[PDB]
Amino acid sequence: MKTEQQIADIVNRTITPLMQEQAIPGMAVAVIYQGKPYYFTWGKADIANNHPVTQQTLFELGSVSKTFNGVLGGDAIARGEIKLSDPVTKYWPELTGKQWQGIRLLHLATYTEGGLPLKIPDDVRDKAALLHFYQNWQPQWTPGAKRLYANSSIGLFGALAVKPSGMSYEEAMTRRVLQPLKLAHTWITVPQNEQKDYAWGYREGKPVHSSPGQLDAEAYGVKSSVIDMARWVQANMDASHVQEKTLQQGIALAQSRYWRIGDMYQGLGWEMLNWPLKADSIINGSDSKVALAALPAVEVNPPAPAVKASWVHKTGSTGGFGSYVAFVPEKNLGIVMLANKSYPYPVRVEAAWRILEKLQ
């Protein structure tokens, strides 16, 4: 097995040119290797004010937030509070249009509802406007026909999934996921006494933070540190240490296979491919030209239970940040890459692959 110095050499050999070539001000990486997390930090969380990246720096996860959504939903399934087969109208009866009649929670959770838009429109800023938007949306195809990635589908799934609990989404996420997993540096809303650790994102050489929007927490609005993200990857890779039974089962359910889209399988938030695999499949699959395309979907019903021989991963971005998380349960190997600049998805995936390939 490799020493810490050997792992550091491997990580730095990839990250050093990456940050220079992509003009990334700050990064934090965790490698999970033979059961242990190894942490690395470089650069600046705030350039003008000279604040370094540390193991406590908070990064905007962007759509990596959907992995938290999927686990919270899995926990609700395990609690018996919801079933993915339930109609959306069980939880939002005011969606009375015929286009909602056959849409199930399953479809919202997995981008298979019929073609909701990538984001809720900017001018939808209250509950009345949100209802109007969904009521008047018209699908492009029947439920299950295609997978088309969106924030507005899984975002609504998260809002509906927590209804039986009587809690807000943020309250339920905190009580049911973050607190049991001891994720004390993971936030939907960063409190004032933690703002000192909230990195600035950089877009076109200017510091930026993400703007709020409807159903943001549910789809793209989580912030977290490298320590918490490593602990999150560890718990998702192997939840045998998680003593809360419904949370352990909910983690497993987010890695069930619900749909087959070529060689990719859709979990709850997490996306999976069989392992072993060819690097080009994930690198090319991460390009927006594939990842954002509407592709035919094949249902896996009942969902296939998690298998160890899988590459489990999720990309995410905001205006100023780019993140990537991936793990292989069979190998007990994983990686977290957090950066305060958005940079191309295939570059993220290739760098992660290069590191993990040397740690086989």
Author numbering: 2 to 361
Lines from the paper:
CMY-185 is a CMY-2-like β-lactamase and was identified in an Escherichia coli clinical strain isolated from a patient who underwent treatment with ceftazidime-avibactam. CMY-185, possessing four amino acid substitutions of A114E, Q120K, V211S, and N346Y relative to CMY-2, confers high-level ceftazidime-avibactam resistance, and accumulation of the substitutions incrementally enhances the level of resistance to this agent. The substituted Y346 residue is a major driver of the functional evolution as it rejects primary avibactam binding due to the steric hindrance and augments oxyimino-cephalosporin hydrolysis through a drastic structural change, rotating the side chain of Y346 and then disrupting the H-10 helix structure. The other substituted residues E114 and K120 incrementally contribute to rejection of avibactam inhibition, while S211 stimulates the turnover rate of the oxyimino-cephalosporin hydrolysis.
To obtain further structural insights on CMY-185, we determined the crystal structures of the CMY-185 free form and its complex with ceftazidime at the resolution of 1.35 and 2.40 Å, respectively. Structural comparison with these enzymes showed that the CMY-185 free-form structure is quite similar to the structure of CMY-2 and CMY-136 with the root-mean-square deviation (RMSD) values of 0.45 and 0.52 Å, respectively. The substituted residues K120, S211, and Y346 in CMY-185 are located adjacent to the substrate binding site. The residues S211 and Y346 form hydrogen bonds with residues E61 and S318, respectively, while the side chain of K120 is exposed to the bulk solvent. The substituted residue E114 is located at the inner molecule, and it forms hydrogen bonds with the main chain nitrogen atoms of G116 and L117. The effect of the A114E substitution to the overall structure appears to be minimal, resulting in the loop structure around the P118 residue pushed up ~1 Å away. Structural studies indicated that the A114E substitution did not alter the overall structure, and it instead seemed to enhance the intramolecular interaction through the hydrogen bond formation compared to alanine.
